[PDB]
Amino acid sequence: VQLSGEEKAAVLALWDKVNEEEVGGEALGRLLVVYPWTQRFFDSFGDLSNPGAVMGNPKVKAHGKKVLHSFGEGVHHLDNLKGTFAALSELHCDKLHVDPENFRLLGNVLVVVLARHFGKDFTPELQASYQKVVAGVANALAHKYH
C-alpha cells in the first residue's frame, strides 16, 4: 500500500515476531465471539456456542493460522496486494458470499490482538501503519465483488 520506507521497515520488523498460530487462533476466535453472525460461515467447525468452546476449538486455531499466514504474504508483498489476494477474493465472493464489511472487522480484530500481544511496543505510530495494511488487505479481498 501507500507506506513510507521507514513505515514499511517497522511493519516488517514487527511481523518477524508474530507467531501466526497463537495470533491467528486468537484473532479468528475473537471475531467469532465479538461478532456472532460470523459463526454462520463456520458451522462445520462444530460447537461455537460459548467463548470457552470457541477459543479452544482446534479447527478455529488451524484456520486462524491459515488466515494469518495469508496476512503475512500480504505484508511481504505490499506492492501487489490485488494480485496476491486475487484467488482468495474469488473464493470469498463467488463461493462463500461473505459481505466485505466483515473483512474490515477481522482486520480490526487483528490489530486489537497485535496490541494485546505487543503492549507498549505497539505504538500509536505502528498501529497507524498496520491500519493501512489491514485496509489494503480488506480492499484487495473485496476486489472481485459486486
Binding site: 475473537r30 496490541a115 500509536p124
Partner: protein
C-alpha cells in the same frame, strides 16, 4: 441498556481501568488521529502533536464521560443527553467516527490490560461502546 451479563463485565473491566481512564482516553485519541487522519478535522483549534496538553485534557474529559456512563448503564440517554446534543446538533460528527474512536479505545485497553482483556470482556466492551455511540448520535435518529 445491555444484558445483565454484559453490565457485570463492563463494570468489572472499568474497575480495573480505575484511575487510568483519562490517560487511556488521551492515548485512544492519539491513536485515532494518527490511524484515521480524517478525524483531525473536528479539532482545528487543537495542537494535535504528541504530548499535546489539549489532547491530554480532552482525553480526561472523554474518560470521565465513559466512567459516568458505566455508572448509568440502565439510563444512558438520560446521563449523556447533553453530549448527544453537542455531538449531533452542534458538531455534526459523522457517525462513522464513533466506530473509529471505539476501535482505538479497545486497542488502548488491550495494550495496557492484556490479562484482563479476555474475549468475553472484549465482547461486552464492544457492546458498551456501541451503545454509548448510539446515544451520542441519537439526534440523527
Amino acid at each position: 441498556v445491555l444484558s445483565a451479563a454484559d453490565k457485570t463485565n463492563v463494570k468489572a473491566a472499568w474497575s480495573k481501568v480505575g484511575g487510568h481512564a483519562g490517560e487511556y482516553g488521551a492515548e485512544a485519541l492519539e491513536r485515532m488521529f494518527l490511524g484515521f487522519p480524517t478525524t483531525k478535522t473536528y479539532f482545528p483549534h487543537f495542537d494535535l502533536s504528541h504530548g499535546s496538553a489539549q489532547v491530554k485534557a480532552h482525553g480526561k474529559k472523554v474518560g470521565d464521560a465513559l466512567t459516568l456512563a458505566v455508572g448509568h448503564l440502565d439510563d444512558l440517554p438520560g446521563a449523556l443527553s447533553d453530549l448527544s446534543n453537542l455531538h449531533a446538533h452542534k458538531l455534526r460528527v459523522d457517525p462513522v467516527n464513533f466506530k473509529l474512536l471505539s476501535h482505538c479505545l479497545l486497542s488502548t485497553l488491550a495494550v495496557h490490560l492484556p490479562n484482563d482483556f479476555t474475549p468475553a470482556v472484549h465482547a461486552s466492551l464492544d457492546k458498551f461502546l456501541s451503545s454509548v455511540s448510539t446515544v451520542l448520535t441519537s439526534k440523527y435518529r
